[PDB]
Amino acid sequence: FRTFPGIPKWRKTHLTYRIVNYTPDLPKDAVDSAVEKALKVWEEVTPLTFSRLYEGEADIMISFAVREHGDFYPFDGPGNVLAHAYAPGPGINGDAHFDDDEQWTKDTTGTNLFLVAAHEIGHSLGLFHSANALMYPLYHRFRLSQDDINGIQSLYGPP
Ligand SMILES: COc1ccc(S(=O)(=O)NCC(=O)NO)cc1
Ligand SMILES: [Ca+2]
Ligand SMILES: [Ca+2]
Ligand SMILES: [Ca+2]
Ligand SMILES: [Zn+2]
Ligand SMILES: [Zn+2]
């Protein structure tokens, strides 16, 4: 496992998130389910408790965007970069973005939103790319690996 430069971590247990907008590809409940389920993957093996917000600035702002979208890492159309997220911190830090030129699916016939979001939320909680592993930098009965659990626990702690 690997962490971000300067070992950044959330300095609180209660974290908030907001889904700012939605992909055309799925219904909103399917997006909510994938994201909500993506947060539980990490919530289950840490003392972190997530809460949802509909107004205002949440810690983890979740949005779908294409090309240039307000940060130093513009998306690249279909394929290549599917999504990116930021390390723990204020502002853009902690936020997760999804490239809406990909075809986001409930299943595997396109790009699975749940799997990518789980990997993206890993970035939101301070995990960088692994060497084996959900945090491995390539998209390919799902379970969180020991290498993944090592990083989040040796940072926040166990439940
Ligand atoms: C399923 O987990 C992922 C998520 C995204 C990607 S990727 O978009 O191809 N690489 C960018 C990346 O590392 N985002 O966090 C690769 C694997
Ligand atoms: Ca943020
Ligand atoms: Ca892309
Ligand atoms: Ca799309
Ligand atoms: Zn972005
Ligand atoms: Zn990644």
CB 31 within 8 A of CB 22: yes
Q: Which of 43, 55, 68, 120 is catalytic?
A: 120
Instruction: Compute the distance between CA of residue 11 and CA of residue 26 in angstroms, rounded to an integer.
Output: 34
Tally of domains within the chain: 1
Q: Please confirm, yes or no, whether 120 is among the known catalytic residues.
A: yes
89: left (phi over 0), alpha (psi -120 to 50) or beta: left
Q: In what side-by-side order are the strands of the sheet with 14-19?
A: 49-52, 14-19, 60-65, 96-99, 83-85
**Contact residues of ligand 1, CB 6 A cut-off:** 81-85, 115-116, 119-120, 123, 137-139
**Axis-axis angle for helices 113-124, 28-43 (nearest 10):** 50
- CATH classification of the domain holding 16: 3.40.390.10
Please give the method by which this entry was determined: X-ray
Structure token pair of residue 133: 């592993």
The domain in which residue 34 lies consists of 1-159
Instruction: Compute the distance between CA of residue 58 and CA of residue 12 in angstroms, rounded to an integer.
Output: 14
Instruction: Compute the distance between CA of residue 98 and CA of residue 118 in angstroms, rounded to an integer.
Output: 12
Strand 49-52 relative to strand 60-65, pairing: unpaired
Count of alpha carbons within 13 angstroms of residue 19, beta-carbon side: 19
